[PDB]
DNA sequence: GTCGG
DNA sequence: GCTGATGCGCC
DNA sequence: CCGACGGCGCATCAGC
């Protein structure tokens, strides 16, 4: 936690701009600045030193000088002591409650956990499950438990059809000692960029995981993306494991490398890499890397035979999953 | 809030 | 129905 | 100073 105080301050400012101000670009500006300062291998002495880093301008430099002087930020001190700002920030921690829904609830007098539980009728399905597991979803997953969850998913997927390949991505594939949730990239030979030779390919895997009581709830479900809740089985007399968030993304098998690049992240690494691609006249999504024409229209997919191939196109040296974190 | 053109 | 916009989610 | 800021899946709603 070398520049922990500064990165915490910038994260708190980011969350305010997203949750209260609904200023997504100011949120992205603060997260970018937080990320670059976290990687900086010196104790920052002044704002002028911070200002030399990319993504740190005049206003963040001024907030760092204030922070290093006083140990706090008057702007945050005031945000913390404002009821409406504080209420919106709390409600946004419930899965399914974003900035819009949070501000709506605060206007209806719903500002606390007790207010939410008294007014379940006013919540959509996602928001009901977010409230139900509010405590559990706050908790991080030790790598040891992620390895157990991996064993269940991969073995259960193999039982449905041995042609499925399931890859656990997110912070796990970046080699983190704990993860916020479980992200599963799924492929099957019968789903490519060219044809859907089999229907219900994702449905069948979700059903199997429900059948053995691993998946416990569904937040949303379509043909390619599942968003739900799972839980490790516990032994006799021992306390239940917390309920965990699970994302399952079915990716065309021929577009695996763009898919696994997307799903490995981190989110800030993806934004930086995709931003850099545009500067080099390319657009990257989870399916393809495409060149941009003179117009700014995306051309045809370029050939990708590895993660590294995508880095080569945008003239970046390969970063291993472990060097893509914040 | 930042920054390259 | 459908489409397009918006909210909230994922990395 | 200015335009751009990553890209998209699913749920929900307004308008036809
Ligand atoms: N969900 C997945 C995972 C992998 N693959 C394919 C892509 C590659 O052709 C091969 C394995 O690639 P990986 O990047 O997963 O390689 P590993 O690091 O697991 O193993 P190795 O280094 O031996 O290739 O399987 C796939 O179609 N679907
Ligand atoms: C950090 C100071 C702010 O920078 P931004 O362009 O969000 C403004 O300079 C003043 O703060 P605000 O008036 O409270 O937004
Ligand atoms: Mg700078
Ligand atoms: Mg939230
Ligand atoms: Mg995340
Ligand atoms: Mg995750
Ligand atoms: Mg996730």
Coordinates of C-alpha atoms (C1' of nucleotides) and ligand atoms in Angstrom, one line a residue:
Chain A
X1 CA 0.0 0.0 0.0
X2 CA 2.8 2.4 -1.1
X3 CA 0.5 5.3 -2.2
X4 CA -2.5 3.7 -0.5
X5 CA -3.9 7.0 0.9
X6 CA -3.9 8.8 -2.6
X7 CA -5.4 5.7 -4.5
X8 CA -8.1 5.3 -1.8
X9 CA -9.0 9.1 -2.1
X10 CA -9.1 8.8 -5.9
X11 CA -11.3 5.6 -5.8
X12 CA -13.7 7.3 -3.3
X13 CA -13.9 10.4 -5.7
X14 CA -14.5 8.0 -8.7
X15 CA -17.4 6.2 -6.9
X16 CA -18.9 9.7 -6.0
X17 CA -18.8 10.9 -9.7
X18 CA -20.3 7.5 -10.9
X19 CA -23.0 7.0 -8.1
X20 CA -24.0 10.6 -7.2
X21 CA -23.0 12.9 -10.1
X22 CA -23.6 10.3 -12.8
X23 CA -20.4 11.5 -14.6
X24 CA -19.0 8.3 -16.1
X25 CA -16.0 10.1 -17.8
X26 CA -15.0 11.8 -14.4
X27 CA -15.3 8.2 -12.8
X28 CA -13.1 6.8 -15.6
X29 CA -10.6 9.7 -15.2
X30 CA -10.3 9.1 -11.4
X31 CA -9.9 5.2 -11.8
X32 CA -7.2 5.7 -14.6
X33 CA -5.3 8.2 -12.2
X34 CA -5.8 5.7 -9.3
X35 CA -4.4 2.9 -11.5
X36 CA -1.3 4.8 -12.8
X37 CA -0.4 6.0 -9.2
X38 CA -0.8 2.4 -7.8
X39 CA 1.9 1.1 -10.3
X40 CA 4.3 4.1 -9.5
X41 CA 7.1 2.5 -7.6
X42 CA 8.0 5.6 -5.5
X43 CA 6.3 7.3 -2.4
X44 CA 4.7 10.4 -4.1
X45 CA 6.1 13.5 -2.3
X46 CA 4.1 16.3 -4.1
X47 CA 1.2 16.8 -6.6
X48 CA 3.8 18.1 -9.2
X49 CA 5.5 14.6 -9.0
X50 CA 2.1 12.9 -9.5
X51 CA 1.3 15.4 -12.4
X52 CA 4.1 13.9 -14.5
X53 CA 2.2 10.5 -14.7
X54 CA -0.3 10.0 -17.6
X55 CA -4.0 10.5 -16.4
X56 CA -2.9 12.9 -13.5
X57 CA -3.6 16.6 -14.5
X58 CA -3.9 19.9 -12.6
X59 CA -7.0 19.1 -10.5
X60 CA -5.8 15.7 -9.2
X61 CA -2.3 17.2 -8.5
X62 CA -4.1 19.9 -6.4
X63 CA -6.1 17.2 -4.5
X64 CA -2.8 15.2 -3.8
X65 CA -1.1 18.3 -2.4
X66 CA -4.1 18.9 -0.1
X67 CA -4.2 15.2 0.9
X68 CA -0.4 15.1 1.7
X69 CA -0.7 18.3 3.7
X70 CA -3.9 17.6 5.8
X71 CA -4.2 13.8 5.5
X72 CA -7.8 14.2 4.1
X73 CA -9.9 16.0 1.4
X74 CA -12.5 18.6 2.4
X75 CA -14.5 17.6 -0.7
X76 CA -14.7 13.9 0.6
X77 CA -15.2 15.1 4.2
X78 CA -18.4 17.0 3.0
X79 CA -19.6 14.1 0.7
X80 CA -19.3 11.7 3.7
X81 CA -21.4 14.1 5.9
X82 CA -24.2 14.7 3.2
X83 CA -27.2 12.3 3.8
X84 CA -28.3 12.1 0.1
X85 CA -24.8 11.4 -1.3
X86 CA -24.1 8.9 1.6
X87 CA -27.5 7.2 1.1
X88 CA -27.0 6.8 -2.8
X89 CA -23.4 5.4 -2.2
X90 CA -24.8 2.8 0.2
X91 CA -27.8 1.7 -2.0
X92 CA -25.4 1.4 -5.1
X93 CA -23.6 -1.4 -3.2
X94 CA -26.8 -3.6 -3.7
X95 CA -26.5 -5.7 -7.0
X96 CA -29.1 -4.4 -9.4
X97 CA -29.2 -0.8 -7.8
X98 CA -27.2 1.7 -10.0
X99 CA -27.0 5.5 -9.8
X100 CA -30.6 6.0 -11.3
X101 CA -32.5 3.5 -9.1
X102 CA -30.5 4.6 -6.0
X103 CA -31.5 8.3 -6.4
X104 CA -35.2 7.2 -7.1
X105 CA -35.2 5.1 -3.8
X106 CA -33.7 8.1 -1.8
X107 CA -36.6 10.3 -3.1
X108 CA -39.2 7.7 -2.0
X109 CA -37.5 7.7 1.6
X110 CA -35.8 4.3 1.1
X111 CA -32.2 5.1 2.3
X112 CA -31.2 2.1 4.6
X113 CA -31.0 -1.7 4.7
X114 CA -34.2 -1.8 6.9
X115 CA -35.9 0.5 4.3
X116 CA -35.0 -2.0 1.5
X117 CA -36.2 -5.1 3.5
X118 CA -39.5 -3.3 4.3
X119 CA -40.1 -2.4 0.6
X120 CA -39.0 -5.7 -1.3
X121 CA -42.3 -5.2 -3.3
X122 CA -40.5 -2.1 -4.8
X123 CA -37.4 -4.1 -6.0
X124 CA -37.1 -6.0 -9.4
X125 CA -35.8 -9.7 -9.3
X126 CA -32.0 -8.8 -9.6
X127 CA -32.4 -6.2 -6.8
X128 CA -34.3 -8.7 -4.6
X129 CA -31.4 -11.2 -4.9
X130 CA -28.8 -8.4 -4.4
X131 CA -30.6 -7.5 -1.1
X132 CA -30.9 -11.2 0.0
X133 CA -27.1 -11.9 -0.4
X134 CA -26.0 -8.2 0.4
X135 CA -23.6 -9.5 3.2
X136 CA -22.3 -12.5 1.2
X137 CA -21.5 -10.4 -2.0
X138 CA -19.4 -8.0 0.1
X139 CA -17.0 -10.9 1.0
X140 CA -14.1 -11.8 -1.3
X141 CA -13.4 -15.5 -2.3
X142 CA -10.0 -17.0 -1.2
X143 CA -8.1 -18.7 -4.1
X144 CA -8.4 -22.0 -2.2
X145 CA -12.3 -21.8 -2.6
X146 CA -11.9 -20.6 -6.3
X147 CA -9.9 -23.8 -6.9
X148 CA -12.8 -25.9 -5.4
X149 CA -15.4 -23.9 -7.5
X150 CA -13.2 -24.5 -10.6
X151 CA -13.1 -28.3 -9.9
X152 CA -17.0 -28.4 -9.6
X153 CA -17.7 -26.3 -12.8
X154 CA -15.1 -28.0 -15.1
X155 CA -16.2 -31.6 -14.0
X156 CA -19.9 -30.7 -14.2
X157 CA -19.4 -29.1 -17.7
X158 CA -17.4 -32.3 -18.8
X159 CA -20.5 -34.5 -17.7
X160 CA -22.9 -32.5 -20.0
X161 CA -20.6 -32.9 -23.1
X162 CA -16.8 -33.6 -23.2
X163 CA -16.5 -31.1 -26.2
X164 CA -17.2 -28.1 -23.8
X165 CA -14.0 -26.3 -22.6
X166 CA -14.6 -24.0 -19.5
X167 CA -11.9 -21.5 -18.5
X168 CA -12.1 -19.5 -15.1
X169 CA -11.0 -15.9 -16.0
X170 CA -11.2 -12.6 -14.1
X171 CA -8.7 -12.0 -11.2
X172 CA -8.4 -15.8 -10.8
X173 CA -6.6 -16.1 -14.2
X174 CA -4.5 -13.0 -13.2
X175 CA -3.4 -15.2 -10.3
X176 CA -5.0 -13.2 -7.5
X177 CA -5.0 -14.7 -3.9
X178 CA -8.7 -13.7 -3.6
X179 CA -11.5 -12.9 -6.2
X180 CA -14.7 -10.8 -6.0
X181 CA -16.6 -13.5 -7.9
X182 CA -16.2 -16.4 -10.4
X183 CA -16.0 -15.6 -14.2
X184 CA -16.3 -18.7 -16.5
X185 CA -15.5 -18.5 -20.3
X186 CA -17.3 -21.4 -22.1
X187 CA -16.7 -22.7 -25.7
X188 CA -18.3 -25.6 -27.7
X189 CA -17.3 -26.7 -31.2
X190 CA -21.0 -26.2 -32.3
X191 CA -21.0 -22.4 -31.6
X192 CA -18.6 -20.5 -33.9
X193 CA -18.7 -17.0 -35.6
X194 CA -20.1 -18.9 -38.7
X195 CA -22.9 -21.2 -37.2
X196 CA -25.0 -22.2 -34.1
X197 CA -25.0 -26.0 -34.9
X198 CA -26.7 -26.7 -31.5
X199 CA -29.2 -24.5 -29.5
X200 CA -29.4 -24.1 -25.7
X201 CA -25.6 -24.7 -25.3
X202 CA -25.4 -22.3 -22.3
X203 CA -28.8 -23.4 -20.9
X204 CA -27.7 -27.1 -20.6
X205 CA -24.5 -26.1 -18.5
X206 CA -26.6 -23.7 -16.2
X207 CA -29.2 -26.6 -15.8
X208 CA -26.5 -29.2 -14.8
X209 CA -25.0 -26.6 -12.3
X210 CA -28.5 -26.0 -10.9
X211 CA -29.2 -29.9 -10.8
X212 CA -26.1 -30.5 -8.4
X213 CA -27.2 -27.3 -6.4
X214 CA -24.0 -25.3 -7.3
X215 CA -26.0 -22.4 -9.1
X216 CA -28.7 -21.3 -6.5
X217 CA -30.1 -18.1 -8.2
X218 CA -30.4 -16.4 -11.7
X219 CA -30.0 -12.5 -11.9
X220 CA -30.1 -12.6 -15.8
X221 CA -29.8 -15.3 -18.5
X222 CA -29.7 -15.2 -22.3
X223 CA -28.1 -17.3 -25.2
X224 CA -24.5 -16.2 -24.5
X225 CA -24.3 -14.6 -21.0
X226 CA -25.4 -16.1 -17.5
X227 CA -25.3 -13.8 -14.4
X228 CA -26.2 -15.7 -11.2
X229 CA -25.4 -16.9 -7.7
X230 CA -23.5 -20.2 -6.6
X231 CA -22.3 -21.8 -3.3
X232 CA -19.7 -24.5 -2.5
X233 CA -21.1 -27.5 -0.6
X234 CA -20.2 -27.6 3.1
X235 CA -19.5 -30.8 5.2
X236 CA -21.5 -32.1 8.2
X237 CA -22.1 -29.7 11.2
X238 CA -19.9 -27.0 9.5
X239 CA -21.1 -23.4 8.7
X240 CA -22.3 -22.8 5.1
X241 CA -19.9 -21.1 2.6
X242 CA -21.1 -17.6 1.6
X243 CA -23.2 -17.3 -1.6
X244 CA -20.9 -16.1 -4.5
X245 CA -21.6 -14.2 -7.8
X246 CA -21.0 -16.3 -11.0
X247 CA -20.7 -15.0 -14.6
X248 CA -20.7 -17.5 -17.4
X249 CA -20.0 -16.2 -21.0
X250 CA -20.4 -18.5 -24.0
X251 CA -17.9 -17.2 -26.7
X252 CA -17.6 -18.5 -30.3
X253 CA -14.9 -21.2 -30.2
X254 CA -12.9 -19.6 -33.1
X255 CA -12.9 -16.2 -31.2
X256 CA -11.5 -17.7 -27.9
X257 CA -8.4 -15.5 -27.7
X258 CA -10.3 -12.1 -28.0
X259 CA -12.8 -13.7 -25.6
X260 CA -10.3 -14.7 -22.9
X261 CA -8.4 -11.4 -23.3
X262 CA -11.7 -9.6 -22.6
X263 CA -12.7 -11.8 -19.7
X264 CA -9.2 -11.9 -18.0
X265 CA -9.2 -8.0 -17.7
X266 CA -8.7 -6.2 -15.5
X267 CA -11.5 -3.8 -16.5
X268 CA -9.0 -0.8 -16.4
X269 CA -6.4 -2.8 -18.5
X270 CA -9.2 -3.6 -21.1
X271 CA -10.2 0.2 -21.3
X272 CA -6.5 1.2 -21.6
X273 CA -5.7 -1.6 -24.2
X274 CA -8.9 -0.7 -26.2
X275 CA -8.2 3.1 -26.0
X276 CA -4.6 2.3 -27.2
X277 CA -6.0 0.2 -30.1
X278 CA -8.1 3.2 -31.4
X279 CA -4.9 5.4 -31.3
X280 CA -3.3 2.7 -33.5
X281 CA -6.4 2.6 -35.8
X282 CA -8.0 -0.7 -34.5
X283 CA -11.1 -1.6 -32.5
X284 CA -11.0 -4.6 -30.1
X285 CA -14.1 -6.3 -28.5
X286 CA -14.5 -9.8 -27.0
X287 CA -14.9 -11.3 -30.6
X288 CA -12.4 -9.6 -33.0
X289 CA -9.7 -7.0 -33.6
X290 CA -10.7 -4.9 -36.7
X291 CA -8.8 -2.1 -38.5
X292 CA -10.5 1.4 -38.8
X293 CA -10.8 3.0 -42.4
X294 CA -10.3 6.7 -43.2
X295 CA -14.1 7.1 -42.3
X296 CA -13.7 5.5 -38.9
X297 CA -15.8 2.4 -39.9
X298 CA -14.5 -1.0 -38.6
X299 CA -13.1 -3.3 -41.4
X300 CA -13.1 -7.1 -41.4
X301 CA -11.8 -9.3 -38.5
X302 CA -7.9 -9.8 -38.6
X303 CA -6.5 -13.3 -38.0
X304 CA -5.8 -14.0 -34.3
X305 CA -4.0 -17.3 -33.3
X306 CA -3.0 -16.2 -29.7
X307 CA -3.5 -13.5 -27.0
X308 CA 0.0 -12.1 -28.0
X309 CA -1.2 -11.6 -31.7
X310 CA -3.7 -9.0 -30.4
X311 CA -0.8 -7.2 -28.5
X312 CA 1.4 -7.4 -31.7
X313 CA -1.3 -5.6 -33.9
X314 CA -1.4 -2.6 -31.5
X315 CA 2.4 -2.7 -31.0
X316 CA 2.3 -3.6 -27.3
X317 CA 4.8 -5.9 -25.6
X318 CA 2.9 -9.0 -24.3
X319 CA 1.7 -8.6 -20.6
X320 CA 1.0 -12.0 -18.9
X321 CA -2.4 -12.2 -17.1
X322 CA -0.6 -11.5 -13.7
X323 CA 0.7 -8.1 -15.0
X324 CA -2.9 -7.0 -16.2
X325 CA -4.1 -6.2 -12.6
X326 CA -4.4 -2.9 -10.6
Chain B
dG1 C1' -11.1 15.3 -15.1
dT2 C1' -7.4 14.4 -18.8
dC3 C1' -5.1 15.0 -22.9
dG4 C1' -3.4 14.9 -27.8
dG5 C1' -4.1 17.4 -32.0
Chain C
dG1 C1' -45.3 -8.2 -31.2
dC2 C1' -41.1 -5.1 -32.8
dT3 C1' -37.3 -1.4 -32.4
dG4 C1' -34.4 1.8 -30.1
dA5 C1' -33.2 4.0 -25.8
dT6 C1' -31.8 3.5 -21.2
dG7 C1' -30.1 1.2 -16.8
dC8 C1' -27.0 -2.0 -14.9
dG9 C1' -24.1 -5.4 -15.5
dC10 C1' -19.2 -7.8 -17.1
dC11 C1' -14.0 -7.5 -17.9
Chain D
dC1 C1' -9.6 25.5 -26.2
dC2 C1' -12.4 21.1 -27.7
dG3 C1' -13.9 16.2 -29.0
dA4 C1' -13.3 11.9 -27.2
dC5 C1' -13.1 8.9 -23.5
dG6 C1' -14.0 0.6 -24.6
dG7 C1' -17.4 -2.3 -26.1
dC8 C1' -21.4 -5.1 -25.5
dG9 C1' -25.1 -8.7 -23.1
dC10 C1' -29.6 -8.8 -20.8
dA11 C1' -33.7 -6.5 -18.6
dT12 C1' -37.0 -3.0 -18.9
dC13 C1' -39.8 0.5 -21.0
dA14 C1' -41.9 4.0 -24.5
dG15 C1' -43.7 4.4 -28.8
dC16 C1' -45.8 2.3 -32.8
Ligands
LIG1 N1 -12.4 -22.4 -23.2 C1 -11.5 -22.7 -24.1 C2 -10.1 -22.8 -23.7 C3 -9.2 -23.1 -24.7 N2 -9.6 -23.4 -26.0 C4 -8.7 -23.7 -27.0 C5 -7.8 -22.6 -27.4 C6 -6.4 -23.3 -27.7 O1 -6.5 -23.8 -29.1 C7 -6.4 -24.4 -26.7 C8 -5.7 -24.1 -25.4 O2 -5.4 -22.7 -25.3 P1 -5.2 -22.0 -23.9 O3 -4.9 -20.6 -24.0 O4 -6.3 -22.4 -23.0 O5 -3.8 -22.8 -23.4 P2 -3.3 -23.4 -22.0 O6 -2.4 -22.3 -21.4 O7 -4.5 -23.9 -21.2 O8 -2.4 -24.6 -22.4 P3 -1.2 -24.7 -23.5 O9 -0.2 -23.7 -23.1 O10 -0.7 -26.2 -23.4 O11 -1.9 -24.4 -24.9 O12 -7.8 -24.7 -26.5 C9 -11.0 -23.3 -26.3 O13 -11.4 -23.5 -27.5 N3 -11.9 -23.0 -25.3
LIG2 C1 -11.6 18.2 -8.1 C2 -12.1 19.6 -8.4 C3 -13.1 19.5 -9.6 O1 -12.5 19.0 -10.7 P1 -13.5 18.4 -12.0 O2 -13.5 19.0 -13.7 O3 -14.8 17.1 -11.5 C4 -13.7 20.9 -10.0 O4 -12.6 21.8 -10.3 C5 -14.5 21.6 -8.9 O5 -15.3 20.7 -8.1 P2 -16.9 20.6 -8.1 O6 -17.4 22.0 -8.4 O7 -17.3 20.1 -6.8 O8 -17.2 19.6 -9.2
LIG3 MG1 0.1 14.1 -16.5
LIG4 MG1 -22.8 -1.4 -7.3
LIG5 MG1 -15.3 -6.8 -11.2
LIG6 MG1 -14.5 -11.3 -11.2
LIG7 MG1 -17.9 -11.2 -12.6

